[PDB]
Amino acid sequence: SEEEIREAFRVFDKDGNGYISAAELRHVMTNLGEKLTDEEVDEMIREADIDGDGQVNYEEFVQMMTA
Amino acid sequence: TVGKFYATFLIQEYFRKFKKRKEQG
């Protein structure tokens, strides 16, 4: 299945565009599930968002390994 | 840049463990 990651990312998208605003993603990442570190968050959103706009694409992160 | 695949893996198992954990406790 591909819903192993993608279907779990939608559950955060409140825009339905395909890209969430880093700020929101950061607050949920170190809140829901387990507890990571500010380091493991910022760096995670850094390796993904290369543009710097703020709207990071989640499927671009999911289909990354496939790329 | 250094380990994007590693980061990808992080969320991979993160969502996986959470999805099945939510139905466990």
Domain limits, chain A: 1-67
The answer to whether the Cβ–Cβ distance between A33 and B14 falls below 8 Å is: yes
Contact with chain B for residue A51, Cβ under 8 A: no
| Residue B16: alpha-carbon gap to chain centroid | 6
DSSP, collapsed to helix, strand or coil, labels residue A56 as strand
DSSP, collapsed to helix, strand or coil, labels residue A19 as strand
CA dihedral of B7, B10, B12, B18, whole degrees rounded to 10: -150
* Residue among B2, B7, B15 minimizing CB distance to A8: B15
CA pair distance A15, A21, nearest whole angstrom: 10
CA pair distance A9, B19, nearest whole angstrom: 12
Kindly provide the b/e burial profile for residues A1-13, where b requires at least 16 CB atoms within 10 angstroms of the residue's own CB.
Answer: eeeebeebbeeee
Residue with tokens 């463990």: B17
Which residues have CB under 8 Å from A42's CB, separation 6+?
Answer: A26
Which DSSP state fits A55?
A: E
CA pair distance A21, A45, nearest whole angstrom: 10
CA pair distance A32, A55, nearest whole angstrom: 20
* Residue among A9, A32, A47 minimizing CB distance to B7: A47
In single-letter form, the type of residue at position A57 comes to N
